[PDB]
Amino acid sequence: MEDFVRQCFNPMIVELAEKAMKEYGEDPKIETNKFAAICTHLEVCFMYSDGGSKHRFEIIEGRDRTMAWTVVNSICNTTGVEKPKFLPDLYDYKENRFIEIGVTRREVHTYYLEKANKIKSEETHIHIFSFTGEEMATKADYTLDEESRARIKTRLFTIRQEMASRGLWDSFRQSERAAAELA
Amino acid sequence: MEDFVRQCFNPMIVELAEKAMKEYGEDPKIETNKFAAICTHLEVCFMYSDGGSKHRFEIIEGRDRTMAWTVVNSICNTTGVEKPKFLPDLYDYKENRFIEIGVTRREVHTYYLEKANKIKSEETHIHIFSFTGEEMATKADYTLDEESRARIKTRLFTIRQEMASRGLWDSFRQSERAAAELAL
Amino acid sequence: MEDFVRQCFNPMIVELAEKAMKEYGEDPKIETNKFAAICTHLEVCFMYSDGGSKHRFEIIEGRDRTMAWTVVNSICNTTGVEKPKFLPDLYDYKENRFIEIGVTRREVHTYYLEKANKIKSEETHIHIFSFTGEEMATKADYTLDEESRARIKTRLFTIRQEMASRGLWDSFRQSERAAAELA
Amino acid sequence: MEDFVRQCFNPMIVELAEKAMKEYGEDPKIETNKFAAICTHLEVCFMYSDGGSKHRFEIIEGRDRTMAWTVVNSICNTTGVEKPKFLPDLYDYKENRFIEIGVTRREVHTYYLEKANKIKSEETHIHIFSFTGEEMATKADYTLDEESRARIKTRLFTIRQEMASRGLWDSFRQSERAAAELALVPR
């Protein structure tokens, strides 16, 4: 599963995920499913930022924590938007709102409910993707046009097929359900 | 003809064509006309995908066949379009449809007829270009704007002229008319 | 402060600022605050030119003085616009006007009034940014859309935050105030 | 003048101009004014092709004559537009027409009328720039928006200024008026 992750995502995303996981004390060679999931979330965030006009999104995910909070503080002090309690994934300059991007192998309704109850702020926009082609956004406001989101969903289903053809899909799908049924 | 093919198309297209023809058991050095035709079809598909907005098209032609079918499956599952019986060339995320692209040295109406009768799927769009400047699309819906299609046609006619100035056009034009009579 | 400037701005801007300071007889190693100010103004000008269409702005700032005046004369002779008395920072081909860009650590309107009374031109547009998210432009015409200006403001606030975190913001803010009171 | 040309235009344009001058049996070291003129014309054609959107212009100038005529063949046979009798500079896929671009140190309308009487083509669009900022196009259809043409004119005036600052502008401007009067002499 580790060699698959290193062959499936580009080395920059792999390096960013390795750094983010070593920061939380987790191991790429052991917790390979979390490695894959973090790589997937990063690729989705980057494709999402690429979906709009050139200057539309400020990328928060993928940065170092302190610098990410610095950019969040700058955005809040210059636009007047409330500071989120948890680090978001993007900022939308066009719609003037923070975006929390989610990718799940689970039920999309349950994941959206979990994230919405975790955020509790009436500002941060939520947008969930899944490996089955479903997506759910705050107020059904999907931010991007249909082409960008469809590309993201196609990439996700391709990742799922690639995992299934080598027999890693079942364990990867049950890993996220294991972190929610245990933690 | 083989040296002409290697000089006329960029090395990435030539590499892709050689890999496809070795996948289908053919020889670039012997059947140089099909070498040229596959390079031409690949170039047309690429200009076509470049004709629209940034990421309007998913490119299926030019891939390993297994990965091509994987991408087709992903598209079909995330959008709901029916899975084609034959590998198409592009997928249009804007109009939500697969595109089969044809480049023919023969009469265009006949080529479109054979393509549409082989596809049978009432969803896969068909777009045919010729070496004379004539094009033909399903429902006269040409997908791209006039300028991109005109660039494609200009490039096709330039290929035809470069072939003819070397005495290679007659054999190339009869290569397709011969394999069409042999298949029957 | 010098190391912070060299690690905070990309080497092209740092080199242009070093050239601008050596041309005026100043030393970046000892006048580090003005080093930072020149780097910041250059970055803002370059972000501003990137704010519109690909070929909308002629960049006047960041050149050799003689070549910049040559380009100014060319613009004036081909468009008929009045030649400015001081080198501006940009030329807007869409609105057909020169642009003076300012970045101040004081109030935007004081700086605007000073610059306007200095240039004494009814044609040259003036656009002032601050390190606190405020902006002031001639006739309230901000040239660019909200997204590009918001990007610029966010970057300015991030620079201010980095300075503050290193304990250099106070001296940088009081340096501009100490230079104006000398006149 | 030759050093100025070599340091004023980017190396690709200098190479193209040298190739064209040798193709016409002329020495860029001796005929430095014509050297600069070819360089300026090529740069203007390239900025012009940039001025539009992505797939608008087929660039004809800058190619060798055989392939240029081959591309004009392809365009005429796939679009139905008329055969130009002389090699034009660009082809506009949006407006579906060939474009002849001229850059003159003389009066713009004099140059336009000379070119339009030479080519005598009903479809070939003509667009003339000068080193003073004047421009003139067929039916006042300038093809590009105002910003692109303004950039072109600004660059032309900058070239004029750089030439005059070096003492080369007077000879450059008298070069074109000396070649036009010579062409009007059958004797």
Ligand SMILES: Cc1nnc(C(=O)NC(C)(C)c2nc(C(=O)NCc3ccc(F)cc3)c(O)c(=O)n2C)o1
């Ligand atoms: C519901 C539900 N089910 N699983 C989760 C969940 O949160 N899982 C993790 C931790 C793996 C996660 N993390 C981040 C992230 O950015 N974390 C860094 C951070 C640090 C501090 C701070 F305040 C906020 C965020 C994501 O973006 C993200 O999509 N996920 C899934 O939520």
Ligand SMILES: Cc1nnc(C(=O)NC(C)(C)c2nc(C(=O)NCc3ccc(F)cc3)c(O)c(=O)n2C)o1
């Ligand atoms: C009518 C008519 N006249 N000639 C043909 C014709 O089909 N000729 C060939 C075979 C040379 C061809 N092939 C493909 C292609 O992609 N094939 C690979 C594939 C593999 C598996 C699968 F299920 C379907 C297709 C093209 O795209 C293409 O344009 N052509 C012309 O049709």
Ligand SMILES: Cc1nnc(C(=O)NC(C)(C)c2nc(C(=O)NCc3ccc(F)cc3)c(O)c(=O)n2C)o1
């Ligand atoms: C009010 C108020 N408070 N401080 C200033 C102020 O002007 N500060 C300086 C001198 C540091 C400054 N300079 C230039 C510039 O271009 N200088 C070089 C130049 C000037 C004139 C000319 F004709 C040719 C070249 C800027 O662009 C710029 O933004 N600033 C801030 O204004």
Ligand SMILES: Cc1nnc(C(=O)NC(C)(C)c2nc(C(=O)NCc3ccc(F)cc3)c(O)c(=O)n2C)o1
């Ligand atoms: C009137 C009037 N006043 N000066 C001229 C003029 O034509 N000057 C030259 C020759 C320097 C010129 N040449 C080409 C060009 O492409 N030449 C290639 C070619 C040669 C022979 C042939 F029959 C057709 C084309 C240009 O594009 C161009 O802009 N110019 C200015 O016209």
Ligand SMILES: [Mn+2]
């Ligand atoms: Mn996150």
Ligand SMILES: [Mn+2]
């Ligand atoms: Mn997230």
Ligand SMILES: [Mn+2]
């Ligand atoms: Mn195909």
Ligand SMILES: [Mn+2]
């Ligand atoms: Mn095809």
Ligand SMILES: [Mn+2]
């Ligand atoms: Mn300036």
Ligand SMILES: [Mn+2]
């Ligand atoms: Mn300024």
Ligand SMILES: [Mn+2]
């Ligand atoms: Mn020409």
Ligand SMILES: [Mn+2]
């Ligand atoms: Mn010309």
